[PDB]
Amino acid sequence: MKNIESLFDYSAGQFEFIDHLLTMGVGVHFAALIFFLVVSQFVAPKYRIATALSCIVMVSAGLILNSQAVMWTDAYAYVDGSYQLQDLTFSNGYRYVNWMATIPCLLLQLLIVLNLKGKELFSTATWLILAAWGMIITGYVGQLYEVDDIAQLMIWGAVSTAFFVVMNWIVGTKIFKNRATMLGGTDSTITKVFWLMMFAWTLYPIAYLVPAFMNNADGVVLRQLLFTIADISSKVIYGLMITYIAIQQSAAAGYVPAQQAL
Numbered sequence: 001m002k003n004i005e006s007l008f009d010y011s012a013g014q015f016e017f018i019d020h021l022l023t024m025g026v027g028v029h030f031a032a033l034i035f036f037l038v039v040s041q042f043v044a045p046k047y048r049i050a051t052a053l054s055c056i057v058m059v060s061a062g063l064i065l066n067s068q069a070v071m072w073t074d075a076y077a078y079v080d081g082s083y084q085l086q087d088l089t090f091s092n093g094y095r096y097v098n099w100m101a102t103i104p105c106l107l108l109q110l111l112i113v114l115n116l117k118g119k120e121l122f123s124t125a126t127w128l129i130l131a132a133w134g135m136i137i138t139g140y141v142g143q144l145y146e147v148d149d150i151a152q153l154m155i156w157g158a159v160s161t162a163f164f165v166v167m168n169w170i171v172g173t174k175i176f177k178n179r180a181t182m183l184g185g186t187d188s189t190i191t192k193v194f195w196l197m198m199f200a201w202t203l204y205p206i207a208y209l210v211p212a213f214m215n216n217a218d219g220v221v222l223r224q225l226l227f228t229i230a231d232i233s234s235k236v237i238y239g240l241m242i243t244y245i246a247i248q249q250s251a252a253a254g255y256v257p258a259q260q261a262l
């Protein structure tokens with residue numbers, strides 16, 4: 001009842017488009033899961049955790065998207081020409097809770113292919129995860145107010161954005177100070193990964209703000225469309241680039257299975 005999805009009836013076209021976005025998301029992540037599983041054998045031990053983390057992200061995101069899809073069809077029934085709310089079973093909050101797990105995985109696989117190790121890896125991962133969790137938690141509290149108190153959504157969103165900015169500064173600083181350690185030409189690739197991240201992750205706060213500028217049923221559809229673009233870009237496309245970097249550095253480091261695969 002705290003999310004705008006509960007306020008509207010949906011046309012068949014709107015309802016089925018949202019359902020198809022979510023189900024397509026499930027298929028894309030589980031298809032990618034198999035790809036990451038099969039190619040892990042071509043990654044040197046030093047980097048193989050990075051590809052395993054992509055497997056974990058795929059199933060984590062795939063399970064939440066599948067949960068959202070079933071919750072969506074549980075919550076609404078087609079009555080008198082529109083889909084109308086029947087049960088309080090759908091909310092976006094499950095995405096936020098899941099981010100607590102998937103964002104640390106996405107960040108860790110970046111740090112691994114940057115060749116960080118030992119105390120710097122543990123220290124950098126700790127500050128990044130704390131910053132990320134602060135961002136997620138404040139965002140989560142903010143969206144509890146997207147119906148009742150838009151001013152509170154904005155203020156919690158400003159606090160969240162402060163964590164986001166600091167997180168991105170840590171990430172960017174480590175990338176630009178360590179890309180010279182990267183093998184096989186991937187010092188060039190990692191810069192593109194950073195820009196892909198900036199683009200894809202910024203779509204989430206845009207989705208967060210939809211209630212402020214498009215509080216209607218088409219805004220609900222737009223938000224799910226933005227989440228879909230962002231999810232595929234931040235998890236699947238990002239994971240493919242991380243895996244490419246891992247295999248390329250593995251080969252440059254003399255790992256034979258990587259050399260043959262390329």
Ligand SMILES: CCCCCCCC/C=C\CCCCCCCC(=O)OC[C@H](O)CO
Pocket residue numbers: 123124127162163166170173
């Ligand atoms: C009264 C309400 C409370 C107000 C306060 C809440 C807002 C504070 C937010 C950010 C400050 C913390 C930023 C400090 C981060 C420094 C540590 C760090 O980033 O280390 C990175 C390094 O590159 C890795 O080794």
Ligand SMILES: CCCCCCCC/C=C\CCCCCCCC(=O)OC[C@H](O)CO
Pocket residue numbers: 157158159161162165166168169171172173176177
């Ligand atoms: C809540 C409202 C507050 C609004 C606040 C607006 C300030 C935005 C500024 C920067 C965004 C952070 C982007 C981080 C980009 C990476 C920066 C970086 O990596 O620095 C390069 C390094 O110094 C080379 O060695």
Ligand SMILES: *C/C=C(C)/C=C/C=C(C)/C=C/C1=C(C)CCCC1(C)C
Pocket residue numbers: 099102103106135136138139140157160161164201202204205208230231234235
């Ligand atoms: C796969 C999911 C990912 C990469 C989720 C990323 C989420 C964010 C970057 C969220 C950022 C937010 C803000 C910067 C302010 C508004 C609240 C959030 C949590 C949506």
Ligand SMILES: CCCCCCCC/C=C\CCCCCCCC(=O)O
Pocket residue numbers: 045046047049108112121122125126129130
């Ligand atoms: C309060 C929350 C703090 C969370 C901190 C999490 C710390 C995680 C630290 C690094 C995990 C990396 C483990 C795998 C190392 C891979 C390196 C390698 O095998 O080449």
Ligand SMILES: CCCCCCCC/C=C\CCCCCCCC(=O)O
Pocket residue numbers: 149150151154155157158161205208209
């Ligand atoms: C996620 C990015 C957050 C950006 C910070 C928000 C910037 C705030 C800008 C002006 C706030 C104006 C407050 C007006 C409250 C409207 C109350 C209402 O109409 O219900």
Ligand SMILES: [Br-]
Pocket residue numbers: 011012013014
């Ligand atoms: Br229709």
Ligand SMILES: [Br-]
Pocket residue numbers: 011013014
């Ligand atoms: Br329509």
Ligand SMILES: [Br-]
Pocket residue numbers: 044045046047
């Ligand atoms: Br190795």
Ligand SMILES: [Br-]
Pocket residue numbers: 060061064095098099102
């Ligand atoms: Br997720």
Ligand SMILES: [Br-]
Pocket residue numbers: 185186188189190
């Ligand atoms: Br490149």
